[PDB]
Amino acid sequence: RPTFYRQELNKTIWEVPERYQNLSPVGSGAYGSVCAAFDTKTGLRVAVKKLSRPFQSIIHAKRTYRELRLLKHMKHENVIGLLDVFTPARSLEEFNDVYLVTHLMGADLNNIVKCQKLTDDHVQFLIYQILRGLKYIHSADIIHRDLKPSNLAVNEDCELKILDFGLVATRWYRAPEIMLNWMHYNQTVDIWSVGCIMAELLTGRTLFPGTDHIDQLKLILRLVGTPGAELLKKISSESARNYIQSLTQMPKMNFANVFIGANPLAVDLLEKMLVLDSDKRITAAQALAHAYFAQYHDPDDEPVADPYDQSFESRDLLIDEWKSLTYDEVISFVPPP
Ligand SMILES: O=C(c1ccc(Cl)cc1)N1C[C@@H]2C[C@H](C1)c1cccc(=O)n1C2
Ligand SMILES: O=C(c1ccc(Cl)cc1)N1C[C@@H]2C[C@H](C1)c1cccc(=O)n1C2
Ligand SMILES: O=C(c1ccc(Cl)cc1)N1C[C@@H]2C[C@H](C1)c1cccc(=O)n1C2
Ligand SMILES: Nc1ccc2c(NC3CC3)nc(-c3ccccc3)nc2c1
Numbered sequence: 042r043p044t045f046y047r048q049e050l051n052k053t054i055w056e057v058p059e060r061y062q063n064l065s066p067v068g069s070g071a072y073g074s075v076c077a078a079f080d081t082k083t084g085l086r087v088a089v090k091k092l093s094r095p096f097q098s099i100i101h102a103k104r105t106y107r108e109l110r111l112l113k114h115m116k117h118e119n120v121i122g123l124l125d126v127f128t129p130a131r132s133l134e135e136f137n138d139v140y141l142v143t144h145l146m147g148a149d150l151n152n153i154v155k156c157q158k159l160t161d162d163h164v165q166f167l168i169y170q171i172l173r174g175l176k177y178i179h180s181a182d183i184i185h186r187d188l189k190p191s192n193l194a195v196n197e198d199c200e201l202k203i204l205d206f207g208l209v210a211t212r213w214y215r216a217p218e219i220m221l222n223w224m225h226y227n228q229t230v231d232i233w234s235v236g237c238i239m240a241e242l243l244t245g246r247t248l249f250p251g252t253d254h255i256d257q258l259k260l261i262l263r264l265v266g267t268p269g270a271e272l273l274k275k276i277s278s279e280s281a282r283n284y285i286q287s288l289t290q291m292p293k294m295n296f297a298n299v300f301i302g303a304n305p306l307a308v309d310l311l312e313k314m315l316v317l318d319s320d321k322r323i324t325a326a327q328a329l330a331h332a333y334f335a336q337y338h339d340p341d342d343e344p345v346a347d348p349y350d351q352s353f354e355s356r357d358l359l360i361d362e363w364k365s366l367t368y369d370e371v372i373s374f375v376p377p378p
Pocket of ligand 1: 184
């Protein structure tokens, strides 16, 4: 066991191995607060994330478990990975805190776009990297579910990683089917989000800045058009079907008339990503092979993931059970080479 030391930063006491030095608060998310630190083992600047109230409730405990399971799985250039996980607890009995250690990236994509529209070349590279990471995540039958600029980190080399959570309204980036059904949907919900992000990088503006869920869908249908009969016939919920059928008919827009002056290949890709019907939306693997990425695409360096056991997602367990499973995962952790 390493030697731990204690310090108070903000409202919270941090107890970490002496390996991590010069902790400095950088901010907090919904699921925890984060300090930048110097990692004496690697010489790297790292992010140390202390999860908030990890075992407060059943859903908190299951969320903590989920977070650790997902982070332990991710081994890809374009996805956040786990450098270390630790607890100051010496036994399961006293186990109440979870710290996660990851690479510290320079900024998030919200910071970058909040002043600038990016050149097409830089958009190619950023979206390429997001899709490369997504191919990997999706290959493990994992859906991210919350891709947005604040959940994408970039360093000074313009290298990008998809994050677990950031430190920008989710609804603005959410696929329209997450309002119309739930039976069900697929990995392309993340592709919708990528489309929204790409549009924003190209224009400097949020594509669909809805004030609420009704406004959100209205803004979406103004671009992509109101559903045709062929899509309507695939909607199982009477209320959802009647909701969208009661809207005033909006024709689909030619995206070239919206993203004026953009690379025609960029516009073509956006047309394929922002399809209303998720059965017809482009996949991450398909998108990587799109002509827009001709400068970057390498079918032999776009790896897939090891299989991920998400059977736990369907289980209903007690707080101490999720807590015990989380403890197992801390103990079994093997640091990356
Ligand atoms: O896991 C998802 C989910 C969440 C977001 C996205 Cl983009 C895709 C699927 N769902 C399973 C259930 C019901 C729906 C869909 C849903 C929508 C929004 C949040 C949420 O937790 N859930 C949980
Ligand atoms: O499933 C994930 C998730 C978690 C970790 C990683 Cl590495 C990728 C995605 N997310 C979906 C939403 C919001 C974020 C991101 C999130 C982070 C951590 C736990 C969690 O339940 N959630 C639920
Ligand atoms: O059938 C609906 C539903 C869906 C959309 C609209 Cl506008 C109204 C009701 N719901 C029943 C459950 C829970 C909620 C509401 C819901 C919201 C969005 C999608 C969905 O499948 N469901 C399934
Ligand atoms: N094969 C499909 C394809 C698309 C779908 C979709 N997308 C519409 C843009 C909202 N929505 C819904 C649905 C079903 C029940 C309740 C709420 C939504 N189902 C779909 C099934």
